[PDB]
Design an enzyme around this catalytic site. Structure first.
Site, PDB file in Angstrom:
ATOM      1  N   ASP A  86      32.890  45.055  39.817  1.00 17.57           N
ATOM      2  CA  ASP A  86      33.234  46.448  39.865  1.00 17.57           C
ATOM      3  C   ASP A  86      33.279  46.526  38.661  1.00 17.57           C
ATOM      4  O   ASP A  86      34.784  46.546  38.452  1.00 17.57           O
ATOM      5  CB  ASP A  86      33.005  46.857  41.001  1.00 17.57           C
ATOM      6  CG  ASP A  86      32.800  46.454  41.865  1.00 17.57           C
ATOM      7  OD1 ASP A  86      31.335  46.142  42.208  1.00 17.57           O
ATOM      8  OD2 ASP A  86      33.316  47.272  42.702  1.00 17.57           O
ATOM      9  N   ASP A 132      35.311  39.995  36.174  1.00 20.38           N
ATOM     10  CA  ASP A 132      35.476  40.608  37.732  1.00 20.38           C
ATOM     11  C   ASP A 132      33.655  41.342  37.474  1.00 20.38           C
ATOM     12  O   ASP A 132      32.738  41.685  36.963  1.00 20.38           O
ATOM     13  CB  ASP A 132      35.933  42.089  37.220  1.00 20.38           C
ATOM     14  CG  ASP A 132      35.957  43.092  38.496  1.00 20.38           C
ATOM     15  OD1 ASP A 132      36.133  43.164  39.078  1.00 20.38           O
ATOM     16  OD2 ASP A 132      36.196  44.568  37.575  1.00 20.38           O
TER      17      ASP A 132
END
Ligand code: MG
Length: 246
Positions: free
Chosen positions: A11, A9
């Site tokens: 963020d 991922d």
């Protein structure tokens, strides 16, 4: 046996984007405008639950009071908020470009372990492509960036918790999902990963520590750098061996 791929991922995994990036850009905007407003860590966490950037500024000023510099008229207030948010948005991209958003601990280490050991690396995000690509190119640098495939924003119609982004990454990279390890920070991103049939390690981020990570294969506060390493590439490979119930 190492993973075939590590899928990160963006963020909360590569960078603590909200705590260390967006919040800072708000505060730098407020300072530049002489508003005498600071959003510390904990307040910012609360404001993250209200709405988008314009909506949380409006709600904050309605509750605590509008700055002395703000207009009084409702239509002019709306424009003032729009201006603030445009400025914050500009500054946040400048902060990336200037390399002022730090990587999380252990990210560069883990990426380099993967890349040096023939493990594919991708980034899988709901954020807009420009920011995600900027984070990778500016913060991990161009040599690593050339090797890292980005899957962001509207490349899939169905966003996390839908597995579409992870599935697309696996298909594109040409790897078996069961041989992928996803590093996520949120319960909804974890859901996406598990729905994609992947192993998932959670690295909790500034505003996700209290989320439900029951279905994660392993949970940590961060990846970490020596001498405080939480896990490494080897561990990602080890975690591929499941413990089923006979
Ligand atoms: Mg995240």
């Amino acid at each position: 046996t190492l993973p075939s791929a590590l899928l990160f991922d963006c963020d909360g995994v590569l960078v603590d984007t909200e705590k260390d990036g967006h919040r800072i850009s708000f505060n730098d905007t407020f300072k530049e405008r002489d508003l005498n407003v600071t959003w510390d860590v904990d307040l910012y966490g609360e404001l993250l639950k209200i709405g988008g950037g314009k909506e949380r500024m409006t709600a904050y000023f309605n509750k605590v009071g509008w700055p002395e510099k703000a207009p009084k008229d409702e239509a002019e207030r709306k424009e003032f908020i729009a201006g603030l948010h445009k400025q914050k948005t500009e500054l946040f991209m400048v902060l990336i470009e200037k390399k002022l958003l730090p990587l999380r601990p252990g990210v560069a280490k883990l990426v380099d372990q993967a890349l040096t050991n023939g493990v594919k690396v991708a980034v899988c995000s709901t954020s807009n492509e420009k920011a995600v690509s900027a984070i990778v190119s500016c913060l991990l640098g161009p040599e690593r960036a050339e090797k890292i495939k980005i899957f962001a924003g509207d490349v899939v119609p169905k966003k996390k918790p839908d597995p579409a982004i992870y599935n697309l990454a696996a298909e594109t990279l040409g790897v078996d999902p069961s041989k992928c390890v996803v590093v996520e920070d949120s319960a909804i991103g974890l859901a996406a990963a598990k729905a994609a049939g992947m192993t998932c390690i959670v690295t909790k981020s500034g505003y996700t520590a209290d989320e439900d990570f029951e279905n994660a294969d392993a949970v940590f506060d961060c990846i970490g750098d020596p001498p405080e390493e939480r896990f490494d590439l080897a561990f990602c490979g080890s975690l591929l061996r499941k413990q089923f119930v006979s």
